[PDB]
Design a protein around this ligand. Structure first.
Ligand SMILES: Nc1nc2c(ncn2[C@@H]2O[C@H](COP(=O)(O)OP(=O)(O)NP(=O)(O)O)[C@@H](O)[C@H]2O)c(=O)[nH]1
Ligand SMILES: [Ca+2]
Ligand SMILES: [Mg+2]
Ligand SMILES: [Mg+2]
Length: 166
């Protein structure tokens, strides 16, 4: 059936792996093992359509960000993740936006801005601030929690729906 190539990007430790693993394997990864480049595949029915999701979990740490550009090349949609308790991760979203533009050589790439770790109380990035950023890119802003699963499916499914509008 239809295959959707999704790519998760964002600063180190924002929760890219936890989000992906919660979506695909249904459990929360409590420990922090820096990622180099991992891929996941799973058949799911979205809006009545049986589709194959190929999700690339990329490195947020520069030290593990080797040929990251090459892996992302085939990506059809991207989740740009920051953590609501990490202001710097939010401020650096533009870096990932720029990288995506380069790898895809396009200004119109399906995307979703994700504010992860919404279960944490030390929030320094208010929803409104993220909504303004997303609005400027013309993309949806969705908050998630890889820990409680809140907004997790919504984030990935919305990305599929954005690819469909593409
Ligand atoms: N409370 C809470 N902790 C989270 C959440 N998502 C991730 N974490 C925690 O944050 C740490 C880093 O998460 P991880 O998914 O490894 O981040 P990453 O973005 O994949 N890191 P890297 O880019 O180096 O590969 C882990 O200890 C993980 O449990 C969340 O929604 N809530
Ligand atoms: Ca470990
Ligand atoms: Mg990771
Ligand atoms: Mg403030």
């Amino acid at each position: 059936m239809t295959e959707y190539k999704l790519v998760v990007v964002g600063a180190g430790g924002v929760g890219k792996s936890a989000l992906t693993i919660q979506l695909i394997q249904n459990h929360f990864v409590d420990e922090y093992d820096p990622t180099i480049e991992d891929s996941y595949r799973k058949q799911v029915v979205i809006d009545g359509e049986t589709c194959l999701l190929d999700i690339l979990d990329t490195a947020g740490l520069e030290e593990y960000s080797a040929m990251r550009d090459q892996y992302m090349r085939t990506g059809e949609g991207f989740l740009c993740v920051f953590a609501i308790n990490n202001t710097k991760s939010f401020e650096d979203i533009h870096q990932y936006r720029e990288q995506i533009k380069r790898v895809k050589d396009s200004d119109d790439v399906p995307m979703v801005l994700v504010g992860n770790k919404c279960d944490l109380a030390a929030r320094t990035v208010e929803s409104r601030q993220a909504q303004d950023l997303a609005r400027s890119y013309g993309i949806p802003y969705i908050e998630t929690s890889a820990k409680t699963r809140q907004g997790v499916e919504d984030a990935f499914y919305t990305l599929v729906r954005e690819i469909r509008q593409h």
